[PDB]
With several copies, the nearest count.
Chain A
Amino acid sequence: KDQGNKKRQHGLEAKKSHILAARSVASIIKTSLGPRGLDKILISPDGEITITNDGATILSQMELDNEIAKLLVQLSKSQDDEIGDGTTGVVVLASALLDQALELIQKGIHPIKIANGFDEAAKLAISKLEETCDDISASNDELFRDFLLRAAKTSLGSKIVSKDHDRFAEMAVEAVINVMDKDRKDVDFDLIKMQGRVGGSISDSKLINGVILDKDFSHPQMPKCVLPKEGSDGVKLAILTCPFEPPKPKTKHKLDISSVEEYQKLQTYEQDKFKEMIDDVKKAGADVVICQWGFDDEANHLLLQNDLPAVRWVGGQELEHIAISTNGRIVPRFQDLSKDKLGTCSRIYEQEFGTTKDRMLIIEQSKETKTVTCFVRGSNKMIVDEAERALHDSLCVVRNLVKDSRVVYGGGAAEVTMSLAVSEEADKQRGIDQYAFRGFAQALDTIPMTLAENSGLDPIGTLSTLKSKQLKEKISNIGVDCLGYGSNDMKELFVVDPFIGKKQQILLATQLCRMILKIDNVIISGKD
């Protein structure tokens, strides 16, 4: 079926078209690469308006019919969960490998040889980069606190955060450590909640150790704060998976009212069930009741008399994060409540944020929890979304810094050291793979040349200068200047990149470059 409007490619054709398809998307993100790049205006189909240079956001919004560039979106989707800040770095590096792969094809080298050529060249560059790598925790402990603050400052320097960055730098460090273990080194993005609302400024943003739920405490007369009640155990909260209402059988569901007699009785029976369901909360000692469904008007009447605030319309996913952070349990029925199954937190209070009419709640905890909600304030909706994703980028950089204590010096010095080491070892490796190793070293030179063009420097002159400083003088890390400074040697500036982060970039770039070479044919069906 669908014979017409069917595209078919062959070996002698698609191999040239697959390279041109990658160079089109690559040249688009070369202008936004680096702190001197371009912030692009993007509007999601859901109505969110924001301006950012992040490649993971830009490439995700790209909808195109080129099948080679679709593989760039598939890799960035998997990389966004691992890192998310290396989208612009991998695509340009992968395109540099494809540009060198096309040259090897013209020399008579099969594309499967290029896949194995870059694979052995990537593994060789990992060992060379690890030998020149430096460690933090084994060196200086106080610089470890300074490295985490200044690494986020690099990502927060291109945003309005740069004025208040001092506070958000500490908020990004604590948010990552809370959701992870030092030995396990496992950080999940679902454990850190990123939220923000309009109003206030960025200097008023607070770091919360628990959920948010966006609740006003239902009826306004209910108290906006919850006390420990004379040295109790934490603050007990009730989690209910059943709505608040008189129970009805599943066999009938029908209620017959013959006259005012049965009408007045049924009206009192529904109120008697309201008194029986609230007593189970009092017997368990739960201060606030959290339910998935709304409450009636009579419900807020009995909860107000007993000073028991209410929570309405909580999603199923939010109920899981409450029991984990507060060390609670999920109680299916009403009568199964008890002090052991109630979530225990440090305190519960309603903190009014600026002039915003939301008036949400804040549930914190003294001990380390598995759930952290980062809340950001700003005078405009675009400012909130800009500072939110900028803080999220700082969470991803610190995530890789604590994942591997060893880090490499960035700013272009990492790609030059990896290129000079493979190029020297390329002559020692004979055979057909010798050109595959030389082309891999030339492909690594695209990253510092791209950063040099965006910084206003000669890409050839600066790259050749850095190679002479790392050879004739001594072996060290001196990169191109991304941000304004007096001179070279970013190592003096203490600009570091995570070794596990940079290694993850070169592996995904090689894994995708091989997969692109493993597709010589494109079959696209038409529209019936």
Chain B
Amino acid sequence: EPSKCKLGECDVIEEIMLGEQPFLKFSGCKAGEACTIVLRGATDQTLDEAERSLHDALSVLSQTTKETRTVLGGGCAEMVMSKAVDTEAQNIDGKKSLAVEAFARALRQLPTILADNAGFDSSELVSKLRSSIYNGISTSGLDLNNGTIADMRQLGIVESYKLKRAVVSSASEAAEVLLRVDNIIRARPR
């Protein structure tokens, strides 16, 4: 349909020449964040081995950006996600109201089970943790040593952000296959 779409744009389109070949250099892209590394070699062996070794160097540099970046642990991040899912459970269509709310319940069961093996009362700590973060104090978490709720920034309890994204993504991929199941086909033994 006309005038309905997602359009891009750029300030200046300039045609340049490098290596006896015409090239195009764009300028002033809208909200553009990116880079283009132009490798100038003396042969094909210098070009192919450089691109493979450059991506390996960029992978090590990107590993330090994604890893060592952590989030507040000790039940904090599990409860913080519950507040955002409950916000998603606020504005929602009819049939998915209980489906979105059920996702926030499993997020609160993660610190509940962690408090089970600690030997404390999970129903008391998780309930107070939800009411604490709901109004202000978004940095609070569960303290398994003293059996109370304390600030995670003061205690220094953090967990990796990459680990959080991996568990949530794997749980969505595992639930994608299993929830669609109206019947189970038993695998052939090898």
A touches B in complex, CB < 8 A:
yes
Give A contacts to B, CB under 8 Å: 28, 31, 36-45, 47, 456
Closest Cβ neighbor of B180 among chain A residues = A38
The interface residues of chain B, by DSSP majority, are classed as: loop
Chain A nearest Cβ from B184, distance in angstroms: 8
Taking a contact as CB atoms under 8 Å apart, the answer to whether B188 and A31 are in contact is no
Chain B nearest Cβ from A55, distance in angstroms: 13
Taking a contact as CB atoms under 8 Å apart, the answer to whether B95 and A456 are in contact is yes
Closest Cβ neighbor of B190 among chain A residues = A47
Contacts of B95 in A (CB 8 A): 456
Contacts of B185 in A (CB 8 A): 40-42
Taking a contact as CB atoms under 8 Å apart, the answer to whether B183 and A31 are in contact is yes
10 contacts between A and B (CB under 8 A): A37-B180, A38-B180, A38-B182, A40-B183, A40-B185, A41-B185, A41-B187, A42-B185, A43-B188, A47-B190
Which of A37, A38, A40, A47 counts the most B-chain CB atoms under 10 A from its CB?
A38
In this assembly, does B12 line the interface, its C-beta being within 8 Å of a C-beta of chain A? no
In this assembly, does B5 line the interface, its C-beta being within 8 Å of a C-beta of chain A? no
Taking a contact as CB atoms under 8 Å apart, the answer to whether B188 and A45 are in contact is yes
Contacts of B177 in A (CB 8 A): 39
The interface residues of chain A, by DSSP majority, are classed as: loop
Give B contacts to A, CB under 8 Å: 95, 177, 180-183, 185, 187-188, 190
In the complex, the 5 A-B pairs of residues with the closest C-beta atoms, listed nearest first = A43-B188, A31-B182, A40-B185, A38-B180, A41-B185
Contacts of A456 in B (CB 8 A): 95
Chain B nearest Cβ from A359, distance in angstroms: 16
Taking a contact as CB atoms under 8 Å apart, the answer to whether B181 and A38 are in contact is yes
Closest Cβ neighbor of A28 among chain B residues = B183
Seed contacts A39-B180, A47-B190; 12 additional CB < 8 Å A-B pairs: A28-B183, A31-B182, A38-B180, A38-B181, A38-B182, A38-B183, A39-B177, A40-B183, A40-B185, A42-B185, A45-B188, A456-B95
Contacts of B187 in A (CB 8 A): 41, 43
Chain A nearest Cβ from B1, distance in angstroms: 9
Closest Cβ neighbor of B182 among chain A residues = A31
Chain B nearest Cβ from A262, distance in angstroms: 52
Chain A nearest Cβ from B97, distance in angstroms: 14
Chain B nearest Cβ from A490, distance in angstroms: 16
Closest Cβ neighbor of B185 among chain A residues = A40
Which of B180, B187, B190 counts the most A-chain CB atoms under 10 A from its CB?
B180
Chain B nearest Cβ from A377, distance in angstroms: 18
Closest Cβ neighbor of A454 among chain B residues = B182
Chain A nearest Cβ from B182, distance in angstroms: 4
Chain A nearest Cβ from B93, distance in angstroms: 11
Closest Cβ neighbor of A53 among chain B residues = B180
Contacts of A41 in B (CB 8 A): 185, 187
Closest Cβ neighbor of A40 among chain B residues = B185
Contacts of B183 in A (CB 8 A): 28, 31, 38, 40
Contacts of B180 in A (CB 8 A): 36-39
Contacts of A40 in B (CB 8 A): 183, 185
Contacts of B190 in A (CB 8 A): 43, 47
Closest Cβ neighbor of A51 among chain B residues = B177
Contacts of A45 in B (CB 8 A): 188
Closest Cβ neighbor of B177 among chain A residues = A39
Which of A37, A43, A47 counts the most B-chain CB atoms under 10 A from its CB?
A43
Contacts of A39 in B (CB 8 A): 177, 180
Closest Cβ neighbor of A456 among chain B residues = B95
Contacts of B181 in A (CB 8 A): 38
Chain B nearest Cβ from A509, distance in angstroms: 23
Chain B nearest Cβ from A380, distance in angstroms: 14
Contacts of A28 in B (CB 8 A): 183
Chain B nearest Cβ from A354, distance in angstroms: 12
Closest Cβ neighbor of A31 among chain B residues = B182
